[PDB]
Amino acid sequence: SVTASTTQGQQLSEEELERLEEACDMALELNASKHRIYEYVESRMSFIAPNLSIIIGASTAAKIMGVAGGLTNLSKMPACNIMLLGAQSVLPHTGYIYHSDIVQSLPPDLRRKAARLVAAKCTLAARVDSFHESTEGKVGYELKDEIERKFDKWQE
């Protein structure tokens, strides 16, 4: 309001205002579509791979389940490849679980090691939901408590 009192800006057209209006309307369409996709992918990924979704987050769980080629290919991958799963001058030897929110929830030098912590345990989680045990996700909850317990252990 303070800088709308002094804008130094000229008015738009009617075509310019309606062009910006439909641009903002399709932008809200893209935002609501993104959140609809997010809700569906978290629901169906908590059904398909509950423990991996609990550890990493179900969108990144779906990304590393897809680029590996499903759960039954994600299990028989080691922990040192699921770290680099989704890789490609921005950061090297990084996968989809380096740019996760739970691996960016810490200082920038605390990052790489944390990737190896989230890659290993979720690999266990991936193996745990390659067979259909722990459908409620208790292995994911226990391992995720272990993850952020180690994160709080490293932090001050």
Next chain:
RNA sequence: AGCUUUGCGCAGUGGCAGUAUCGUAGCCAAUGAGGUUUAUCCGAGGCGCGAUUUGCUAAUUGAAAACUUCCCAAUAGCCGUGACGACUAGUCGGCAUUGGCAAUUUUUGACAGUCUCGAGACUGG
């Protein structure tokens, strides 16, 4: 029967030893430590804290450097002299101590160097 591999133990030669060798009871660690190289790859301990027995010998200071001393008194050659003694003023033997013992015959150095085949020669300017 011989050869031989791997791990461990013992001893020995040699090498290394504070960017070395360990402890860790605190935490983490193959359910993955730690990764800038080659990363759909590698794979072992890591971070902190804390350390780096025993016998022998030398040397120094110190009065004393840790295994059951100093001090006084006396005892442990010959020419003269004094007595005692012996033998005829003289001689001899032993004992004793109240002066002396580097000037040719002795005990305060004619010795030292050299040369020749047990024996001699040369020099000491």
